[PDB]
Design a protein around this nucleic acid. Structure first.
Ligand SMILES: O=c1ccn([C@@H]2O[C@H](COP(=O)(O)OP(=O)(O)O)[C@@H](O)[C@H]2O)c(=O)[nH]1
Ligand code: BEF
Ligand SMILES: [Mg+2]
Length: 504
RNA sequence: AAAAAAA
């Protein structure tokens, strides 16, 4: 308790200025960006967030509808109307599930800064992994930022060491893409963070206001966050009807269903090839893959196939953070190209004018389907989406309707010609051992979501394994492994293990 | 070994 709902039933910068809620400095900043007008969530979120009363804020809004400024504008306004207290102390802590999203939010704050130098006094520092710790701390000491954007790990590192120095006067903490940060693997980290910030706060352990933002969340998050929500009441600001699908309606969704999993790649290649020809290389797209190794492999194929027409960018968690930042900014700027990536780029990342979102296989989690396709059709723009799967993945499409009420109308089958298989497979440089590691990674990936997506383990896993045979152009062939490895896999008893591997 | 998450 206590969760108060406010379902989706005009607010303007000028009105907010004249009403006295917002200062001229920030009004100048947002007005100079020349947006047509505040998004519904911003209209529905700003004023309640500044309400000093003892209440937390949960906000659900579809993808690409400007949630970032929905909590950045209030933060800045808060910093304005508290400017003579604690000045050189952190007053707002923003947490994101990925480094690039945190750096993106930082860039948005610096975008706010560049539109009005008067707001630069309210400095900002990002705290993420893959960056020099000392340089960040020197930046912390030098700037005395009022806003911190961070990823949980590095934030915890900093908090364990400098909570007293910087974080004793936090008034706001923000969970962007809250639901993922409230999933297993992140919840304990955020509980430690909230605990430290609350423990270290100068006024009270319940002083801090918490903001939860995402395109995908329900009432379950209210329960999942009960330990990090200090205040007594909690506002639910929803710009989506209960039964309405969370997916952005402007996205033209489709699914390509194949007999086997491997030739969904062939399905995608035929799709992209059709797209570069029709659009005359004026094509900007993001293609998602379930795993790093498969991302890299798929990247190698798309490089062999389409490098002559478009840039092919490889984006995943094993890419050095410097290169991640370089390619996100490049793919942010460039007018065309193919971003080949895992779910690291599924949430939050804002790439202007992405034409299509492609998916080979399923996402690491069901909700990430909504966020994946959310990378296109942003800020009023149009967009389409294609899901490339095999028949044994069909239950996932079934799961999309039962839970999230997501109905993919356009569905079609696919069978590859011998020519494309020969052309693609002949142009693979990877040794059988690499193919083995890649397929093994896919087996591991699909095994971890058997329960979630209601897959038939006895059917889907052998199919994933068969990809090894397909790529080596011998469907009868099975993956060569050792007895210890097969035992280590724990399929020593399962017939599927025998059906999918060959102990050589 | 899955996708994230500083060591
Ligand atoms: O008042 C606004 C705020 C947002 N935007 C658009 O929304 C985008 C921001 O999307 P964001 O990622 O911040 O929202 P989210 O994806 O988190 O829902 C900007 O680039 C703008 O094009 C807009 O048109 N008017
Ligand atoms: F949901 Be938005 F893409 F951050
Ligand atoms: Mg966001």
């Amino acid at each position: 308790s206590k969760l108060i709902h406010v379902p989706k039933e005009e607010v303007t910068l000028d009105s907010l200025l004249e009403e006295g809620v917002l200062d001229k400095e920030i009004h100048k900043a947002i007005t100079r960006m020349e947006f047509p007008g505040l998004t519904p969530v911003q209209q529905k979120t700003i004023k309640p967030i500044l309400s000093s009363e003892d209440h937390d804020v949960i906000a659900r809004a579809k993808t690409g509808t400007g949630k970032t400024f929905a909590f950045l504008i209030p933060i800045f306004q808060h910093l304005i109307n508290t400017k003579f207290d604690s000045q050189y102390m952190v007053k707002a802590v923003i947490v994101a599930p990925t480094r690039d999203l945190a750096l993106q939010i930082e860039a948005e704050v610096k975008k706010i800064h560049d539109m009005n130098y008067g707001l630069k006094k309210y400095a900002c520092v990002s705290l993420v992994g893959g960056t020099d710790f000392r340089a960040a701390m020197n930046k912390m000491n030098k700037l005395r930022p009022n806003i911190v954007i961070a990823t949980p790990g590095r934030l915890i590192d900093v908090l364990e060491k400098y909570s007293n120095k910087f974080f004793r006067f936090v008034d706001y903490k923000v969970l962007d893409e809250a639901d993922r940060l409230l999933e297993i693997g992140f919840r304990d980290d955020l509980e430690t963070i909230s605990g430290i910030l609350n423990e270290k706060n100068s006024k009270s352990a319940d002083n801090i206001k918490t903001l939860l933002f995402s395109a995908t969340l329900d009432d379950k998050v209210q329960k999942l966050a009960n330990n990090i929500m200090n205040k007594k009441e909690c506002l639910f600001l929803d710009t989506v009807d209960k039964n309405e699908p969370e997916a952005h309606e402007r996205i033209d969704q489709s699914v390509v269903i194949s007999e086997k999993f491997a030739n969904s790649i062939f399905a995608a290649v035929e799709h992209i090839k059709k797209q570069i020809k029709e659009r005359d290389s004026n094509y900007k797209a993001i293609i998602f893959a379930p795993t790093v190794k498969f991302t890299s492999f798929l990247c190698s194929i798309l490089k062999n196939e389409f490098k002559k027409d478009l840039p092919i960018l490889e984006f995943h968690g094993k890419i050095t953070q410097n290169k991640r930042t370089s390619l996100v900014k490049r793919f942010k700027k460039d007018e065309s190209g193919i971003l080949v990536c895992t779910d690291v780029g599924a949430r939050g990342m804002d790439f202007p004018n992405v034409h299509e979102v492609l998916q080979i296989g399923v996402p690491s989690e069901l909700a990430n389907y909504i966020h994946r396709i959310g990378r296109t059709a942003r800020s009023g723009k149009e967009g389409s989406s294609v899901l490339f799967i095999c028949k044994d993945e069909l239950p996932f499409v079934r799961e999309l309707e039962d839970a999230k009420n997501i109905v993919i109308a356009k569905q079609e089958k696919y069978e590859p010609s011998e020519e494309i298989k020969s052309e693609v497979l002949e142009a693979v440089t990877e040794e059988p051992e690499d193919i083995s590691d890649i397929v093994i990674s896919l087996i591991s990936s699909y095994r971890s979501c058997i329960k979630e997506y209601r897959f038939s383990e006895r059917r889907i896993l052998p199919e994933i394994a068969s990809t090894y045979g397909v790529l080596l152009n011998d469907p009868q062939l099975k993956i060569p492994v050792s007895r210890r490895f097969l035992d280590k896999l724990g399929l020593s008893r399962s017939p599927i293990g025998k059906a999918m591997f060959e102990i050589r």
